[PDB]
Amino acid sequence: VSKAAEFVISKVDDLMNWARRGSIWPMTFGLACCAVEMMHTGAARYDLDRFGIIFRPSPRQSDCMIVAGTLTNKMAPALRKVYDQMPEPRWVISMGSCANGGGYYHYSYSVVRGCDRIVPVDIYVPGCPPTAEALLYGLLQLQKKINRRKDFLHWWTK
Amino acid sequence: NFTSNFGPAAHGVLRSVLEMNGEVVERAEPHIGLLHRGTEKLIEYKTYLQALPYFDRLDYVSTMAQEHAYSLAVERLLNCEVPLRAQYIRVLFCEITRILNHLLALTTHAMDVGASTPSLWAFEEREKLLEFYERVSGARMHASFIRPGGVAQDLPLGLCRDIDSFTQQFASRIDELEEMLTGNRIWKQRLVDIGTVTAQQAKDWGFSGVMLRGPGVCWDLRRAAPYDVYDQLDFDVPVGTRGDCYDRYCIRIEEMRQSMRIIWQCPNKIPSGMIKADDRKLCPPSRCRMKLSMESSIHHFELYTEGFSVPAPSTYTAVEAPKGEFGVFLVSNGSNRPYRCKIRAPGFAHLQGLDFMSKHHMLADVVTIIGTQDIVSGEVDR
Amino acid sequence: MSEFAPICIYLVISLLVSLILLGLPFDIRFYLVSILFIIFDPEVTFSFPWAVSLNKIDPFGSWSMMAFLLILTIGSLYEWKRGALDW
Amino acid sequence: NLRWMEAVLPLGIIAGMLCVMGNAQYYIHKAAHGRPKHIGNDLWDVAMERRDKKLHEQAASS
Amino acid sequence: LRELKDEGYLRCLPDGNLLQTKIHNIGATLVGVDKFGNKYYEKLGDTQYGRHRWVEYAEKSRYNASQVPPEWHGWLHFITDHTGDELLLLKPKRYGVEHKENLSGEGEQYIYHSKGHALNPGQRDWTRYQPWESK
Amino acid sequence: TKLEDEQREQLAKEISKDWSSVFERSINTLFLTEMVRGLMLTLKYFFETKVTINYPFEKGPLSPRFRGEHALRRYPTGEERCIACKLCEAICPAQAITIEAEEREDGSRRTTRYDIDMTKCIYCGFCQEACPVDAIVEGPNFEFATETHEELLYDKEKLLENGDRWETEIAENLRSESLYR
Amino acid sequence: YIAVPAEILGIILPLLLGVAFLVLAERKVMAFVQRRKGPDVVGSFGLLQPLADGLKLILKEPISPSSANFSLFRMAPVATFMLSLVAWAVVPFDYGMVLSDSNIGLLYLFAISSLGVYGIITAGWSSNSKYAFLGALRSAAQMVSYEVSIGLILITVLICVGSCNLSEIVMAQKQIWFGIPLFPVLVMFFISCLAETNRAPFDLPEAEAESVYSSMGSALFFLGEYANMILMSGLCTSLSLGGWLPILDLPIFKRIPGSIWFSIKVILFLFLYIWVRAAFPRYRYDQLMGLGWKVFLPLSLAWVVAVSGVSVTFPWLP
Numbered sequence A: 001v002s003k004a005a006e007f008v009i010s011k012v013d014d015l016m017n018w019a020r021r022g023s024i025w026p027m028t029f030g031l032a033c034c035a036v037e038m039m040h041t042g043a044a045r046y047d048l049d050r051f052g053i054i055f056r057p058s059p060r061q062s063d064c065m066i067v068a069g070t071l072t073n074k075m076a077p078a079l080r081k082v083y084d085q086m087p088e089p090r091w092v093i094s095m096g097s098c099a100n101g102g103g104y105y106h107y108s109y110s111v112v113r114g115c116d117r118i119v120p121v122d123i124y125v126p127g128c129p130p131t132a133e134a135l136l137y138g139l140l141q142l143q144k145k146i147n148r149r150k151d152f153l154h155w156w157t158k
Numbered sequence B: 001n002f003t004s005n006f007g008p009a010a011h012g013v014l015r016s017v018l019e020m021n022g023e024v025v026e027r028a029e030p031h032i033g034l035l036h037r038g039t040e041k042l043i044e045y046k047t048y049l050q051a052l053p054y055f056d057r058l059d060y061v062s063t064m065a066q067e068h069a070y071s072l073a074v075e076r077l078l079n080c081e082v083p084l085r086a087q088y089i090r091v092l093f094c095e096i097t098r099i100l101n102h103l104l105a106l107t108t109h110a111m112d113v114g115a116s117t118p119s120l121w122a123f124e125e126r127e128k129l130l131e132f133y134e135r136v137s138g139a140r141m142h143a144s145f146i147r148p149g150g151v152a153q154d155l156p157l158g159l160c161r162d163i164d165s166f167t168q169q170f171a172s173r174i175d176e177l178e179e180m181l182t183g184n185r186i187w188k189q190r191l192v193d194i195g196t197v198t199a200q201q202a203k204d205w206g207f208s209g210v211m212l213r214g215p216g217v218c219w220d221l222r223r224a225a226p227y228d229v230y231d232q233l234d235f236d237v238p239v240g241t242r243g244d245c246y247d248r249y250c251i252r253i254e255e256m257r258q259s260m261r262i263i264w265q266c267p268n269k270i271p272s273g274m275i276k277a278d279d280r281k282l283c284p285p286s287r288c289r290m291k292l293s294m295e296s297s298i299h300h301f302e303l304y305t306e307g308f309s310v311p312a313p314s315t316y317t318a319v320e321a322p323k324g325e326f327g328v329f330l331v332s333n334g335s336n337r338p339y340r341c342k343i344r345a346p347g348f349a350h351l352q353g354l355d356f357m358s359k360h361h362m363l364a365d366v367v368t369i370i371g372t373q374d375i376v377s378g379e380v381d382r
Numbered sequence C: 001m002s003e004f005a006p007i008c009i010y011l012v013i014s015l016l017v018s019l020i021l022l023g024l025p026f027d028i029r030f031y032l033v034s035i036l037f038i039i040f041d042p043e044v045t046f047s048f049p050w051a052v053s054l055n056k057i058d059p060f061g062s063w064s065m066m067a068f069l070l071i072l073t074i075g076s077l078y079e080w081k082r083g084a085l086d087w
Numbered sequence D: 001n002l003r004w005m006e007a008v009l010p011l012g013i014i015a016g017m018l019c020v021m022g023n024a025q026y027y028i029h030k031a032a033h034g035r036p037k038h039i040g041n042d043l044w045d046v047a048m049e050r051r052d053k054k055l056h057e058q059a060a061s062s
Numbered sequence E: 001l002r003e004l005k006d007e008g009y010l011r012c013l014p015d016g017n018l019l020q021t022k023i024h025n026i027g028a029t030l031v032g033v034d035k036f037g038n039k040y041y042e043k044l045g046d047t048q049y050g051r052h053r054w055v056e057y058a059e060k061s062r063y064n065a066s067q068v069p070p071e072w073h074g075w076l077h078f079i080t081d082h083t084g085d086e087l088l089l090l091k092p093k094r095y096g097v098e099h100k101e102n103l104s105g106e107g108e109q110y111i112y113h114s115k116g117h118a119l120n121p122g123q124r125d126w127t128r129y130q131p132w133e134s135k
Numbered sequence F: 001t002k003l004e005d006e007q008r009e010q011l012a013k014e015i016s017k018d019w020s021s022v023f024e025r026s027i028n029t030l031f032l033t034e035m036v037r038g039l040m041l042t043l044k045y046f047f048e049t050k051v052t053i054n055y056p057f058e059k060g061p062l063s064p065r066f067r068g069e070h071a072l073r074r075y076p077t078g079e080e081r082c083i084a085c086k087l088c089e090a091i092c093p094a095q096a097i098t099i100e101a102e103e104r105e106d107g108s109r110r111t112t113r114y115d116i117d118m119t120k121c122i123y124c125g126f127c128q129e130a131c132p133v134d135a136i137v138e139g140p141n142f143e144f145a146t147e148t149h150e151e152l153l154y155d156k157e158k159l160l161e162n163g164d165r166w167e168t169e170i171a172e173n174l175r176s177e178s179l180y181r
Numbered sequence G: 001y002i003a004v005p006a007e008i009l010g011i012i013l014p015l016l017l018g019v020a021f022l023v024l025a026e027r028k029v030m031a032f033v034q035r036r037k038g039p040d041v042v043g044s045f046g047l048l049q050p051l052a053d054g055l056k057l058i059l060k061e062p063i064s065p066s067s068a069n070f071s072l073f074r075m076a077p078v079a080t081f082m083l084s085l086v087a088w089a090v091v092p093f094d095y096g097m098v099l100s101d102s103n104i105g106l107l108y109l110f111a112i113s114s115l116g117v118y119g120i121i122t123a124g125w126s127s128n129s130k131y132a133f134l135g136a137l138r139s140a141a142q143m144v145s146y147e148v149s150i151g152l153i154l155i156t157v158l159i160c161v162g163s164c165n166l167s168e169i170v171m172a173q174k175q176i177w178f179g180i181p182l183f184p185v186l187v188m189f190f191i192s193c194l195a196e197t198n199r200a201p202f203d204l205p206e207a208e209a210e211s212v213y214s215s216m217g218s219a220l221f222f223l224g225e226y227a228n229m230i231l232m233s234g235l236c237t238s239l240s241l242g243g244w245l246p247i248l249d250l251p252i253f254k255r256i257p258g259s260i261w262f263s264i265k266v267i268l269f270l271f272l273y274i275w276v277r278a279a280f281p282r283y284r285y286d287q288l289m290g291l292g293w294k295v296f297l298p299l300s301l302a303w304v305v306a307v308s309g310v311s312v313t314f315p316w317l318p
């Protein structure tokens, strides 16, 4: 395995993952009241920019998509078209309780039972609306996921 | 005439389409179905005590005035009086909710126009008030705390002292914010004379709340039809002289200050007593009685299985929400499920407003108009 | 001269570094504003030599330059009252 | 109490860079010709530099 | 020197947060230490209302929330100013499960599943009848 | 628009009474005193302290009346509390509970399956009010942010039973709410 | 022969380091203004934030555009970059600590600003959609109007002192800072520098483009904008605040290397940029161009006339 080269590969993966986790750039999708709470996360109390996180509006240069709210049969195509227009490394955080699993209006027409059907959600979150602490902990869970992302090793073995 | 689109801060989800001409909005038209849920259908296939959270979800900024309106509707239809301490704490929290909504709408307007520091300071204050919520009952937002006939749980000890501390520091904070925005020539030149509305077309397009009170006509439901303790709580009710963005803004700040006056008048008169009922047939019994007496258990069981039954008639009930005349139309008949509960959020009136009052302006002024209207697509569509 | 040689070497080196950075990841309103600029830009052009040499010219220089400014200022006033710079 | 110093600090780096930036070329030129740059060389000083250089080389060779 | 500097001090240089917590510590006092090794401090005084009780996780590299046990979770979220040692004097007996942070990402077996999910070694079957099943 | 011409005249004839007034207003709008005042306020806030709760080390304030990750308590004897009244399922406004019981062998009644697909369970609170034995409760834990929907479909009472890992903390809350609830 | 490329590299690289840390400090100090901390996780004090953002934008999967895919789209960002830097060529950091003593420096800076206008307009039109083209036209008009105002202000500061090369100007200030007597001129020049790069209160072009594309292309464009920002700050402090000259002229200040003074002044002006950004709402476009063509042109012209007058009646004019 050239144990030295495997160590260099491990360090390269560490650097790459550290950069990608410390410069993460979300993309809001503020359908319903969770948007409010998400703003409270981006507010002064549980600051988000402190973790190197900037709500970039244009979906051509963002990394995550935060589906915060409640999908709708009228809104699904727009969400899918926005998701497609992102670069390769992507992640999806499903805020709220109806962006994941239908939630309340789950038992109602004109509502998509959870955004999992449209985009491949990565980490959801619980809440109604999730306490700003819960959303920030969700993003830190996303950091913990992207942190076990040995990638250069995969290319060196592929 | 160009045909531009507008699908945007996070000021809700809305699809504006604009017949344009140079930099003039010859005709703006919103597409609004973009967040629909079937709240009325659900309420019907649901109940009273089970459908209260729906009203909590409508107009998700002002998260308690809605429950207050629904509770007033059920009580009116039911003839169930409510004790004085319940009324007083209910008004206290309705006014805290008004302050919440005003902070959010005002400073999000400031962000749309370009400022950011007012947004962050207002959001700190909103954090304080949401902490009050989640201490009294439930989560930060969406506290299902105002049931038919009073409140759910009594409030803790020390909450009044914290209320007073917040009252003082918050007078100071409003003063800071007003010094930061009111008078800045940029803000003045960006806001004034943008979206004039004569009272004739105001009453025609059926505005309510600050909007209707912006241009001239002085009419709010708290003074006209004083549903609750509001009499003993004298206040001011400001009124604007030339209906436009700047005057609606000043109205909003004066409404904040009057809400502070009310929020202080309550903890000086709050009559320590019982809460929420005197019949364990419309309000469930507390835990000690439920687990010690016998008929208390019967009534708790029946009341959490089938709820209370309200009689045949149908009613309309209006409340001065932070936005406007939040209306509820109940057509209940016999059985415990509300036949055809219809909502009358002011979002419809305010969007048709946008349509007519957004002519012969520029796109920055369209954004300004949305700001001053303080729309919540949640309640405009439900 | 012999300073525009450092200038142009700077130009080519900046070209090189910019290309390196690039390759790593692998109506009447407008027209009248432009005209007013073309008219007021030779104003700056003429004010530049007039600026340096206000010591080998007595008040004659100041007055000639003020007369030029007055003619172009009446031009600006006619521009203004016509509202061409209204936007 | 020095919480403000957390904000100037990044800005402060800029200062460093700028200073460094300047100084770099300065000392570079100081080693490329033997004396610091001269601001505003009219033709007189260029002729004098050429003549001085030629004279000193003549003296050194001799 | 270098011992503790490598233990829980030098990680701050590329970790950031640990530097802020070290500053809050030089201002701090001590109020508790929990079996996961982590230290709960309280710098009560003229500081503020939101930030005067906090915790150093005693896992310097991979520190994650929910590592706090329930008692200290309460004391840390201000719900009740009863110290972890007191709530652990309470500590219901005759049953109980030791704490375990929300793994949720370290393989499905450290993660868990329902009774019908294929990755669960149980994999129940939901039929609500029986077949005839002759010999 | 004829009146506007008339109104703009009087409004100018009113503020321009004397010379001191016009001079003051002119250098007021010409030296940006309101701009300077805004800038000074901003700079004060800059020098002032911050809020920035610094989450992963000092979390925010809560209240014993909080709602979060559910749990099923049990008596001090280790005996389960739930008795399958179906009251929580009946009052569920989101129908996010499924519960199916059977007479046990020893005689008492208990729940064979009890699950709450946490998503569809908006966190409203009615659970902890319908229960006549305080079986189900909402412990003050909000950090559970799994990466697969199935988890948030909390399992058939099993994980819900594991809510007893908070049994001390939860207990505290309940005591402080026995008085006024 | 080889010293010149060394000097050019030593001018280019530190500028990029400084501009990365500039955007970092921008976020940090706006945060502190708004009662919050900025990026404080990645680095020891957030110092490793710009490096992390750069590495992310590098490893990010690129997307090549579909509009004149060579020699007109992959060139214009490089054009504006080259223009900003070649402006950075002639700036004095100390006595003789320059790159080129171009004896007409001021005209040079003015010309380079206009060429930056060319850069932005061609970068706007090189795209496909037309709303970006309208935005490009708007930005061009704004930039050129405030350039003519900057020109008149330059003419004032030039009248106050004979020659044009910047070292001579900073000596003239070595007597007494020109910011002191011409304080309103400094305020006008600063507002015009704000409008010239669209930064603090004048953003409606960019705001509308954000209201309605390559990763490295956008990175190059933002880099050019912020570099031009630092340049404008630098020449403002090089011709209106002293330019490496100690205050009060006491021989304890003379131990400071002089170069430090220039850095302190330019960092102060950068802080003022970021500060005035986070205190004020934005103008519209109408009012923006109206102020450009009604409020700053006449004031600047009147100031030229007034300073020429006051300095031609008395024997105070060199």
Ligand code: SF4
Pocket (backbone or CB within 6 Å): A032, A033, A034, A068, A069, A070, A095, A096, A097, A098, A099, A103, A104, A127, A128, A129, B057, B060, F122
């Ligand atoms: S509880 Fe869910 S559906 Fe309701 S406003 Fe919140 S995110 Fe939306």
Ligand code: SF4
Pocket (backbone or CB within 6 Å): F081, F082, F083, F084, F085, F086, F087, F088, F089, F130, F131, F132, F133, F134, F135, F136
């Ligand atoms: S009400 Fe209580 S015990 Fe009764 S069925 Fe539900 S949680 Fe189970």
Ligand code: SF4
Pocket (backbone or CB within 6 Å): F088, F091, F092, F093, F094, F095, F096, F097, F116, F120, F121, F122, F123, F124, F125, F126, F127, F128
């Ligand atoms: S908390 Fe409410 S939504 Fe969840 S199951 Fe219990 S009663 Fe229903």
